[PDB]
Design a protein around this ligand. Structure first.
Ligand SMILES: O=c1[nH]c2cc(C(F)(F)F)c(N3CCOCC3)cc2n(CP(=O)(O)O)c1=O
Ligand SMILES: O=c1[nH]c2cc(C(F)(F)F)c(N3CCOCC3)cc2n(CP(=O)(O)O)c1=O
Lengths: 130, 173, 61, 32, 169, 174, 60, 124, 49, 169
């Protein structure tokens, strides 16, 4: 609009190509007008901050990708609350946690005995389905 | 970071985009020239002339967005490497000893531990006893603390086998 | 036992941290706003400068 | 995936350049 | 000559019709407590069949200003009114072309109406905070046709200005 | 975030590549001067820019020097991002479980009194681990006086702590 | 009276300061300092080289 | 990120370096022009003609390294905010309730807790 | 008690998080090497041309 | 003309002298198990006064090759030999300048010797891993003066080539 309204950006491809160069970093044809330069200054710091945010969010997600490893201990089970866990409803396994004196396993049996809903299963295949 | 083989793919795509840009720019009967198109593709790769044929500029723009995504991902993955720095162990399982030969491993010169490998029938432990029985030099140590000093002076080149309780006790000192 | 162990709130927000949640448009909408404002400012400035140039061309030429 | 979109854009721009060169060459040979 | 003007006129008419369809219904899609469509005035579920005006503006001052803009569709309604005014100006400039400078102001108003419609689309996308409706894509396509029609209108205007400058000498 | 010594080698390679450009550009112009060669070397060291040469040799010197500094300033960006990521890491100690979770910052109590008898007669396993660390420390973490603990904390630069009553701690804080 | 008013410290200003809202200005102030230094250096170099060029051209 | 008022310092340094670059460029008796020098300083600020006066080029290079360090630090701190995202509470102490008035606070309508505030001797 | 508590290793996330070694020259010297190699290659190619 | 030749000669002589001083002593410094100076041949402690060859390379294969290069300073000694050869070539080209191309080969060898000196300085800085000796800064200054002397030498060579091209026409 503005370049053909007052050249170098007389064509539609020259205007679209300078728009692409102002959307990216590098480049081609430098305007001389006040209006085209201020359109570039509005459009260009814009996409500068946007691709900076793209770089920052991609680095943030790659930082997320190398975060905390999966579970390898009962202390890892105590340290979280998202992934629930349970045992069989009858047997010496539940009697092991019920008669445990270690406060970690006591907190495990406290969570499993007060779970909503019930984490205990009837058979082994029921735990497999769970 | 980010690649062990894909750098050659980037170079091959660079040569391909250079050949296509030269085929577009130098077939119309300034921007022509095989080294000129190659160096303009190189200029399109990193940051620091433009075609006016309005068709190879599409190739340049898609290559230019392509390498902008590449350098953004490179900055991101290099920040990911410089952020966490969680080093891992090269040896994980018992088959890792038989899978390689650069990092040596040994047992004590006398005891039932070496008799376990001598009397074993598993082909993995048979290969372990074959490697340790023909070891050059002698991988057998005199005492337990001699094995500790041999491992601590190895810088990741020699390991020692023993009972798990004594191993964890030395680990907790 | 009856406050920390009996309760239903795990007091550890250190493990299982914030997973990958993409960038919201709220950080982008204010940038869109100053973009549209700069576009309208440039349009009005270009129109008044072309009006001044047209008046100068009609009066002096 | 970015390799795939690069190959797609490369082939699309190559075929567009080929057809516009064919049309321009045919028009220039027929008219002039 | 007349072919480009007729193409610009039917492009402006199709853009106005798709803008009216975007004002009407099926602008967005949001799964309620089941899926439900909305057209920036009222929401309709996919019991089933009832419709009600779900554009309630309540449940810093910039949040209140953004909620006030998102309420009652201040941007796209004025954008559609400016598009109708630009269409009326193009219809008045198509027949009995007395002044050869009103087409530039009509095209400037048309480009500003397109920019305001894009800004209103950005506002409606920002105020959405799961799928999308078809009238949003129709409004986007009408924005594309409006941009192309503005390019065609300013191209015909600069061609007419160059013809007048060649005939003046 | 990089060093105080890598920068000098980078500037030395910068002036060396400018010497290479003024050598080869005057041996085969637009880069006929020493300032033109140095300014194109400065443009090649940063991202943006100006004057593009046409020679094979100048183009390949730019391609060697330029991807070089591309990777280096990308590494600078990633390294400063890593340092600022470290800057927003783990908050200071706010609980006794935070003391039990670490081993770098040692801590002690008074050598005699009911404060040490609290950890000695404790039944909670966290405080039992605390008394295990205090009873088996090398050297002794116990001080004779309270002001001895004050001097032990104030000469530590964040490496040693002390356990005491709340009123005495707040009074010494004031 | 005897812990807050009698004491020789000010207000226990929140939690060790305030809130690392963002990055400090000290790096920015140092690069401001080197920028102003280079600006003044290049300005005086420009002034003396224009003085030299004027003395060369005006006096042939 | 990284600034609440330093951006105005960046704009003021931008105008100052623009004035210095024009004063170098328009005191040699192509690169002249106050808006040309301003737009070249803008082109120096973000990524995307070159002066050949060999003295304002030093100004351009130091401004160009300056804004490169700025955009690098901006990218780094924006990655730092997008990485951790540990928000904090605005209210910390009891004096924070007296320090503001936008966030209200109340007690139960009856009880000795309200009698504590009714019969208090502290001005807070 | 006699292994985990009695031992002199903390061992529960002992891999601390700061580690603020800014940057070593190990990642930089291999790039210096290909820099000097490309410089010498360009020198010899320009001289033979 | 001749003043530039004399300046290039004294710059090459000063660069060779500073390279000899950098090879000699006080190249690097490090606090041992008290401070200790080193000059890439033997280290000397701050009992006090004893000196011994502490440039022991032992206590992937790329680390072995890097230790082999860092042992006995292979790169800067060959760089200093190339600097002495370039200085001898400049001395042979100063008087009785019969060949009009020996100064170019001398300058090319001098620039390559400077580049090898900078590469050896980078290797010597890499192999060290707290302060640094003064001979490192002296070698850096000799590299700077050698670069400037190479620039002045090729400037005199292109001036002589332009004078010969003007006299040939
Ligand atoms: O003496 C016992 N020997 C057991 C042997 C086994 C196994 F050998 F593994 F088959 C199992 N299972 C493990 C869980 O899935 C079902 C089968 C349970 C046993 N139980 C029941 P407990 O009370 O839970 O120990 C005993 O009582
Ligand atoms: O009855 C007791 N009353 C105590 C009262 C205080 C004080 F706070 F000063 F009032 C203190 N100090 C706390 C720290 O600063 C030095 C003195 C110790 C006391 N002790 C010794 P404990 O056995 O270690 O508690 C007692 O026995």
């Amino acid at each position: 609009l503005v370049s053909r309204f007052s050249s170098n950006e007389f064509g539609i491809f020259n205007s679209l190509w300078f728009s692409l160069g102002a959307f990216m970093q590098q480049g081609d044809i430098s305007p001389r007008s006040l209006s085209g330069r201020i359109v570039g200054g509005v459009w260009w710091f814009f996409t500068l901050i946007i691709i900076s945010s793209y770089t920052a969010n991609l680095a943030a997600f790659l930082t997320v990708e190398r975060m905390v490893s999966p579970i390898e201990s009962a202390e890892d089970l105590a340290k979280q609350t998202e992934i629930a866990y349970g045992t069989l409803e009858a047997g010496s396994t539940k009697e092991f946690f019920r008669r445990s004196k270690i406060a970690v396993f006591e907190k495990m049996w406290t969570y499993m005995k007060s779970a909503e809903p019930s984490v205990f299963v009837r058979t082994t295949e029921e735990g497999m389905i769970r | 970071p980010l690649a062990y083989e894909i750098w050659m793919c980037i170079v091959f795509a660079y040569i391909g985009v250079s050949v296509v840009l030269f085929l577009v720019s130098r077939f119309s009967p300034n921007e022509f020239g095989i080294f000129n198109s190659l160096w303009f593709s190189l200029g399109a790769f990193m940051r620091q002339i433009s075609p006016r044929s309005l068709s190879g500029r599409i190739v340049g723009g898609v290559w230019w967005f392509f390498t902008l995504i590449i350098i953004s991902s490179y900055t991101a993955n290099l920040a990911a490497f410089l952020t966490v720095e969680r080093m891992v162990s090269p040896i994980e399982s018992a088959e890792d000893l038989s899978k390689q030969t650069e990092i040596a491993y040994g047992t004590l010169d006398s005891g039932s531990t070496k008799e376990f490998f001598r009397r074993s029938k598993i082909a993995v432990f048979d290969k372990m006893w074959t490697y340790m029985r023909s070891a050059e030099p002698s991988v057998f140590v005199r005492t337990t603390a001699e094995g500790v000093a041999r491992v601590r002076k190895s810088k990741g080149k020699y390991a020692y086998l023993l009972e798990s309780t004594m191993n964890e006790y030395i680990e907790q000192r | 036992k009856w406050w920390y162990d009996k309760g239903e709130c795990g007091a550890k927000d250190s493990g299982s941290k914030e997973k990958t949640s993409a960038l919201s448009l709220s950080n982008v909408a204010g940038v869109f706003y100053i973009l549209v404002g700069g576009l309208g400012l440039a349009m009005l400035v270009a129109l008044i400068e072309f009006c001044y140039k047209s008046r100068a061309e009609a009066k002096r030429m | 995936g970015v390799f795939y979109i690069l190959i797609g854009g490369l082939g699309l721009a190559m075929l567009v350049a080929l057809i516009e060169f064919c049309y321009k060459s045919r028009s220039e040979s027929k008219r002039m | 000559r007349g072919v480009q003007m007729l193409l610009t006129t039917v492009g402006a008419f199709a853009a106005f019709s798709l803008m009216t369809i975007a004002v009407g219904t099926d602008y967005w899609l949001y799964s309620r407590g089941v899926m439900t469509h909305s057209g920036l005035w009222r929401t309709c579920c996919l019991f089933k069949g009832l419709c009600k005006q779900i554009d309630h503006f309540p449940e810093d001052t910039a949040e209140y200003f953004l909620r006030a803009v998102r309420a009652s569709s201040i941007f796209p309604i004025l954008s559609v009114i400016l598009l109708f005014m630009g269409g009326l100006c193009i219809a008045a400039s198509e027949f009995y072309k007395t002044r050869h400078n009103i087409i530039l102001s009509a095209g400037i108003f048309f480009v500003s109406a397109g920019l305001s419609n894009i800004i209103g689309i950005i506002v409606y996308i920002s105020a959405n905070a799961y799928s999308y409706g078809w009238s949003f894509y129709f409004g986007a396509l009408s924005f594309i046709i409006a941009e192309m029609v503005g390019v065609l209108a300013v191209h015909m205007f600069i061609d007419r200005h160059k013809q007048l400058r060649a005939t003046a000498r | 975030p990089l060093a105080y010594e890598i920068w000098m080698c980078i500037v030395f390679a910068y002036i060396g590549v400018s010497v290479v450009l003024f050598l080869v550009s005057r041996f085969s112009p637009n880069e006929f001067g020493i300032f033109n060669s140095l300014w194109f070397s400065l443009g090649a060291f940063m991202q943006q820019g100006d004057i593009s040469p046409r020679s094979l040799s100048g183009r390949i010197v730019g391609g060697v020097w330029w991807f070089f500094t591309l990777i280096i300033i990308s590494s600078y960006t990633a390294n400063l991002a890593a340092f600022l990521t470290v800057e927003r890491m783990v908050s200071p100690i706010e609980s006794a479980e935070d003391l039990a979770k670490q081993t770098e910052i040692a801590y002690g109590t008074l050598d005699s009194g009911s404060t040490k008898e609290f950890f000695r007669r404790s039944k909670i396993a966290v405080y039992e681990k605390m008394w295990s660390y205090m009873k088996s420390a090398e050297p002794s973490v116990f001080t004779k006086t309270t002001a001895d603990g004050v001097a032990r904390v104030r000469k530590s630069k964040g490496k040693f702590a002390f356990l005491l009553e709340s009123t005495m701690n707040e009074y010494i804080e004031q | 009276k005897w812990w807050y008013d009698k004491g020789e410290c000010g207000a226990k200003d929140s939690g060790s300061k305030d809130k690392t809202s963002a990055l400090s200005l000290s790096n920015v102030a140092g690069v401001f300092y080197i920028l102003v230094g280079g600006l003044g250096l290049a300005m005086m170099v420009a002034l003396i080289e224009f003085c030299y060029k004027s003395r060369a051209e005006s006096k042939r």
